[PDB]
Design a protein around this ligand. Structure first.
Ligand code: ASN
Ligand code: ASN
Ligand code: ASN
Ligand code: ASN
Lengths: 312, 326, 326, 312
């Protein structure tokens, strides 16, 4: 039976401790020897750079001591942690994240079977070399494309652009897809000796949008700003003016979109080369922030950041 | 044949690039007469009159174009059988909900745009405009509130949103679904929005020169409170939170909006999550902080209702009631 | 607290396997009392009374269980405040539309099932049944026709379908969207089906012992006409075509149904395609062949309406009118 | 510039001849030298075994004479032809199928840009070794998972279980996925010397379903029957009884589902081993018929057919 390490971080799936979660699912003994460690116990709405750095280093350090990792986490920023670990984890043994939309005490609580299926996924050797995974609602989702689509639905987690890697049925996964984008040990991002990440903020676009958010970030000397643009990454004129300034003043600017699916493209309405802006592609704002932080540990050059956004 | 007025505001439906193949284009560069003349079959279904209100990308849409549109429809109601509004896709869902809450004309108001420019191969704008006129000319379209017609579908202004950056099929009513489908110039309506719209709302913009100041802040891991603080320091009437999950806030953002709400800033919890209600009775004690829960209203759509709510009241209980009825 | 009757028919909500982990299970093996007793919180929202009508997998649902359900609801209407019907997922969308067209009780009728057996880890059935009772007990649920409540969502019997073989979230109203969403025991209704249902339909099954014979044939490349010929040779009252695309037929299948329609078999074009109307004024001259276009009705749902239509009339024009109103 | 062969078969994208279709899109000269051949001019509702056999042999024979193939086809059975060619084509040069929901003469006709994007896809060398493709609505879809989801929508074609391979924007594709299931030259199906396929029929399940369709197929001595089951591939009792008989009497039986997404699984309500039935997995009825016909050119053994349904 596989040795599987659960790293617990909190979320609705749990204040409840790592060992209690395991004990609630005695069928885990059927498929793995599971050891639990508490990393934090926080709502993922309070997830932060320090936790991300902790997790990346803990998995990188303990890779050779276990066969697989399950990370119990909140739903709210699961998609941000998953893509951060996707880009920084050098362990090519399965790393699976799981949470729950309903608490332990709720009718038809989703947590137990979710944890079960996450351990099935971490225990499957076919799961190796697919990068960091999210397993929710009997589905195996790659850390780059996966996102929460509904505020309360148990089926919230979907890979809305490129689809899932595999479905789980009766403790077995039929894997039919693997992410082409470079992940884990195929990325140059090395966080082993970092204690902080570049400061990257996100501003929202809408009708009559204020430039004051964008100006507060520039005024604070932020390393990068992601735009949650309208439609194909477009910018209200005030926000465009403040970000045009930012980009030629030592702030990297990424155009993403508030629109829940599809790429922010080059060659549409915005001359990215003229402004020194970067097109996020299918990365939504919060994912674009992840990659922009990491790109900025290697470069400040807008053209080299665009190459990163085309590769990872 | 019914009298239909097109009020043009620009958008990619009125855009052009130098190639029919290349994705490059500039917006709001073609007049309404040009859009009308690219749909020769329009004569078969309506007496079309075009007026050019503005010629902008909807990325530059603003309060003043909203007040101008609402006042014009309300003023001209008795002069026409229906309105079509040519507009950009990017903020269509915002304009549509604004007009849905402020127009008192109960004759069909239909918005329409296009994802491909007028210059491109298989341009979507011509059939979209044909289908928007069909809808505007349909007696059954009346008393449904303000509509968006895109990709053979009639959507209500409240739930309608753009779901994809490039796809001609992008416009969907992601929570409650479309009102009807258009085939061969006919509509089978099976739904009407229950939320109050148009002549059933108390919002009157006929005398208004401006709208209350409402901003949107994004939540994410390690979110800066600096955007929230910038809006509070400029004395904003309202802030909408694009929350994570069921409208949750990073602790820094939480503390700044809690403080803001105690000095009388209106604060609405919405969600960055593309579908589902931001509910009461979740992780946030709204009554305790004087916050308002957006329901199915996404952050940009919650702004619209919060701006109009702040023209009646600054009370968080009464703003909650408004978010439960409109 | 309102009086709610559960009429149990079996389904996976009443299923069990020897493992909480393994996918193996057998259906309709648990009584209603057992389902009631696994939802202790039901006492908080209703006075629940269970009656076991049948105990079957919905894969074995049939005309006689449909007549038994409709007659029982109609008979007992005055004895209760609402009905919940525990049923399998597989044919729920068929039963739901049958009852939507035949029940004259305008008190909430709510159907509910589960994708995981009662024995499985994170079983969906207990919260599903809680949420089906909430809906049945909600005064606002009345006059909406027959409902399906699954995964925190209230769906109308006409548009509701199962979209996934295993997913707890499978039930969706794929053309016109849900009626409301349930959070913390409360419902925000924003839609009601416009098609006529319940006390607005002319269909009366109170005296009926049987339903007219209606079969379904599948279209595909190189489709055999043998299924179609088998139904015609047994003198079927109606055939529904699961067409390709916009309800198109392979030429062999076409020729057999054309022939059948000229001897008085009712023939409805539906589509194997999971969303969208099978329209008139496409590739098939329906008036020429005496065919009927199903609209948004999928083949199994078109059967339901064709069976009930054939109890009033065998005329293709009047069956077309029925498919345009119900 | 790539040499690209268009094989025309009909559909709404066209009675209009192969050369007229090309001439309507003069921008094709920008991206390929395109030669057109008329194979048939039929509505794809009348697609048939003979056409499938023609196409497979024509592409296999002409592989070395061109850089890429585009097949113009009706929407209605596009998903059946695509999966047939996916399994029988030995050319690992791009094979792209395209159609249109609207005719040439319609307002905002989709055909022109659809054909353009199909040639972009056939001309891209990154398209090679992904198996037979469908390009519709700016999307590249694998021939196995792709299906029509709406009767009239231009965006009808989707890979509803595993998602698309790539999006097309400005004549370029960002490919992020490839089908894992074995296709083209990785399959043993060889149709080069076949003039007919095994007779496989499809029967529909619903409440009070007649056994008469299933009995007519058995009575005709059909080689196989696919069940479009209810839910997870289940069978109305009458249909189950007639198919239990078929399976032990020289008819292969495949359990598929009328439900538009998800696998028909083993280990649910049906003892497949006891009945000698095969579970289709994510193959819908009409796709299951494709693979069942081809499996039956190699074997009649239910256990060997199940292995085929687990591999292709
Ligand atoms: N269901 C959840 O996990 C929500 C919670 N606020 C979290 O993300 O931690
Ligand atoms: N397709 C479009 O219309 C996009 C454009 N930027 C607009 O919103 O005006
Ligand atoms: N989940 C389910 O209920 C499936 C079952 N075969 C039924 O329809 O009775
Ligand atoms: N749009 C289409 O192609 C439909 C047509 N009946 C076909 O498949 O040939």
């Amino acid at each position: 039976l596989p040795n599987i390490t659960i790293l617990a971080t909190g979320g609705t799936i749990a204040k409840v401790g790592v060992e209690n979660l395991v004990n609630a699912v005695p069928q885990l003994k059927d498929i793995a020897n599971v050891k639990g460690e508490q990393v934090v116990n926080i709502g993922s709405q309070d997830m932060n750079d320090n936790v991300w750095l902790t997790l990346a280093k803990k998995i990188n350090t303990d890779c050779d001591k276990t066969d697989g990792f399950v990370i119990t986490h909140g739903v709210d920023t699961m998609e941000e942690t998953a893509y951060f670990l996707d880009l920084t984890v050098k362990c090519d043994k399965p790393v699976v994240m799981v949470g729950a939309m309903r608490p332990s005490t709720s009718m038809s609580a989703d947590g137990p079977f979710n944890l079960y299926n996450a351990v099935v996924t971490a225990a499957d050797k076919a799961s190796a070399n697919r990068g960091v995974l999210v397993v929710m609602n009997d589905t195996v989702l790659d850390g780059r494309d996966v996102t929460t689509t509904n505020t309360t639905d148990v089926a919230t987690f979907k890979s809305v652009n490129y689809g899932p890697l595999g479905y789980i049925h009766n403790g077995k996964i039929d894997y039919q897809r693997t992410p082409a984008r470079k992940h884990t040990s195929d990325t140059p991002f090395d966080v082993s000796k970092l204690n902080e990440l570049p400061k990257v903020g996100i501003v929202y676009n809408y009708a009559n949008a204020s430039d004051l958010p964008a100006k507060a970030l520039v005024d604070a000397g932020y390393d990068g700003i992601v735009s949650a643009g309208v439609g194909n990454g477009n910018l209200y004129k005030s926000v465009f003016d403040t970000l045009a300034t930012a980009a030629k003043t030592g702030t990297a600017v990424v155009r993403s979109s508030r629109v829940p699916t599809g790429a922010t493209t080059q060659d549409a309405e915005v001359d990215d080369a003229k402004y020194g802006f970067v097109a996020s592609g299918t990365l939504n704002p919060q994912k674009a922030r992840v990659l922009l932080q990491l790109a900025l540990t290697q470069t400040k050059d807008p053209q080299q950041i665009q190459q990163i956004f085309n590769q990872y």
